[PDB]
Amino acid sequence: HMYYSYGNYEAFARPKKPENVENKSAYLIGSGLASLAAACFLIRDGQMEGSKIHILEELPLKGYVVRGGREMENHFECLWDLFRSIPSLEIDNASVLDEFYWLNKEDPNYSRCRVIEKQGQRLVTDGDFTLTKTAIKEIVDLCLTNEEDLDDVKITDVFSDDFFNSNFWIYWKTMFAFEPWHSAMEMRRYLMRFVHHISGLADFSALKFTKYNQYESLVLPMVEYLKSHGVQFEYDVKVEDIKIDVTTSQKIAREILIDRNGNAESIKLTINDLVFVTNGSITESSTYGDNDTPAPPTDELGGSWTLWKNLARQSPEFGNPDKFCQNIPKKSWFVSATSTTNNKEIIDTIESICKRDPLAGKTVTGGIITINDSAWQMSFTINRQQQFKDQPENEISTWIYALYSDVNGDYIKKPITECSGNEICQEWLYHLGVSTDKIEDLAKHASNTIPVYMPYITSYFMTRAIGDRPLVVPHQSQNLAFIGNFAETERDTVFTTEYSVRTAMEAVYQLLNIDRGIPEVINSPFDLRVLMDAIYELNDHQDLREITKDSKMQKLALAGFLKKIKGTYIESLLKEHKLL
Template structure:
């Protein structure tokens, strides 16, 4: 894509102050070193937590660190759409073999472990449905075409269910699309349209998820850990326990150029102010889908936080008051009940459950992608990844991850909402949904379960209108940019690693005048073969 370069700063004198140590901030640091040739020791990452990666986590259960592992969510990748991500990780040595990149490791892994789900949808009688039959009516197809034909300014802040009738939401297509990409029918129709365009190549294989690519281990071990190690080796200054509470901006009365001039930072020792020099940049990560996450284990229930206790949203709230084009964060955090999730990770201390799942589905670990019980009260889905899914998982232990999509509904076997269920109760519900009642007692005795309540997990799909998300580089900004899942990138889709990496690339390339093209956003409709395959699929 065309790279709009702004007035070039002196990169040798520039200091980059990156607010937030998630994948967007880390990617910005990497691009600044690799492509803008900024001295690594001039790059400073301010991160509130004691670990990098933000929402891309994976590790020990903080409540039971010796016996249980956890990821709050999973990441699915594709070759076609994650072009900026692959560009970044082609330069980062992998976790275990410094002679190959993360990108090369991922490619080799997916050549060995190919996704081809055989049990994508399962009904209430434990029968695997014929998921390849998408079940779309002529009216449903017309409704999809109507949405695709509209421009976003015409769609505005309307919901998905304003464009489709009830039969669409009972189709196999919707059952798979919603759980693959985490859509609810009250989410943004504009975002669904973007997903249709961005992932149209996946439509013919949505029942097998054969286009999905995964990392060797979880997202932290395979992507964040190697990237963090590389940044530190280059000399990047990573400051944990530091979070920015406010920033000052000035506008030139004649040129209208806007500059960030000062950061206000809370640090373990107290507070400090950071003055930005003539050639310095400030990059602000906005919002967080894992803010106020709370963990539970086998016998307790994680709390649902409603009053924004941590600082994942506060900085954006503060900055938004300084200029009308800095976005409207309340659009996204304002309705917790529409966006909360509860996920769970099983740590199995033997292979009894794992072997039964393999026999039941016909999929070895890592090849099955999502399994969804589409008639279950909690609308449960699980993924059995390739084992081990954690780099430090001891031999003889295994993990799987799952989540509920209707956590305020009553379970089929546990007669309470999933939001009120303990880890053990969720495990009991899952075993009954699988129809494995005969091994229930054994599984309960040999499995630890970690649950996570996330108030804002799908907040990035909130119905929005123009201006709710700020531009990566606001108009007339010369030394600051916004990063993360809550900025506006035309045509790209949120809830992807690619979105965060792309916005970081745009910020660094434009602010620092990098003369290198940014990869185009993939559009499968430009390929006649992709379009034809998608058309055949919706008529199947």
């Protein structure tokens, strides 16, 4: 009930108003980005009446909290389709895309220091991938494995020592938060999804960022758009179950069972009432500490995981939530912290490493800096400052995360899950090279650090088999869709904002049978030019002669290849992409 496309014809074309939409309604479970994106497509392309769109939100502090997962790139094809239509709240007569596009041209993101070690020194080989030929072959062999052969396969099952010792793996695992036991299938999707940006892996020159935090820069513009169209925001609503009738030819959602401000209630559905479920949540059951208190660890399942489990009982086609929310290793990333300071000693120390003034209002770290020799495997980033419109102009907020949660720190000799905000700050300042006799005062009195414990922050990447995620529109579903980063669609990568928008758009287009193409995941792994660039970059900027110089059966296979293509367009292409 959809088709994929690419190019300007389908991008700029508008769909006809879908048939009979005047008699349809929609319920969106939650107010995360996928739900809001789906509501926007229901308004813009479905032409559904705003009064018939209901966003059901469950909800009705000692410091600023920043989040991750909002790096963008140019080829977020669905996200830019959406946000060209959302008015900016910052610039008159401009969209969110316009604001974003102009900002990232005036102040393009890049890193001047990507990896540090030995308490604040730059890694000597920063910029190189240091991949052996064995490690490169493992990357290629993974990509040439069919996704259907990677059910439950770990990253450690498909790579060996050379790869795990490479700079490539340092950049990769920290920038995307891959753990060694995570899904090889998802790593494969990432390798092919972003291959056009391999020349920007080490310096983050392909990353693009909104001016402010994602709530300010993406959520509030969508909320204003939706409210201007009459969309209903309903608060204090907890969805406990959805009764679905699963017959031989149809799946139809019949009833949403809720608690509305303490009262058990029922929303009766017909086939003409659409339901969009964001199944699962990486932020559910988050806990918070403060400068003096750790965020208390938890394993609680909240409303989102409970709902997906209740749906999973009703059809095997609705997925297997326990693959994602159970058996999460205790080494996994759980804790992040936001450290806020106006202290000049800290800010100057950061400037000495990242080479830019953190208070200037432009790019600061350009993305995460990784402390390669930290026991916690800690990275931190400082976006353009300030990330909050109410924050004082003399303050920065730094985001810190640790890939390993059950390992004693190098300065604070405790696992991060036992650490207060100030203790996490102290470990960080130690790795910046702050003199050890100043660290305690700078962390406790000059900084305010809020730790957050997220039981499910690694859940998107857990090892999975085909079938564990429901299709966006399960087979024969008439009025039920699954959206967000635990729903299934081809090729695209989870833990990205694009995946939220793509699943939303595919859900709305399929359920309403909207007659317009959905942009395919960008065709870069099929593009011979992109692939030539990848060969050059993966081999740390060697041409084919240097690549093959130490292999008899390559050096002669290349000599015979070059003789056949000499003076041809193939040779000119290879010279253009630096392989000859």
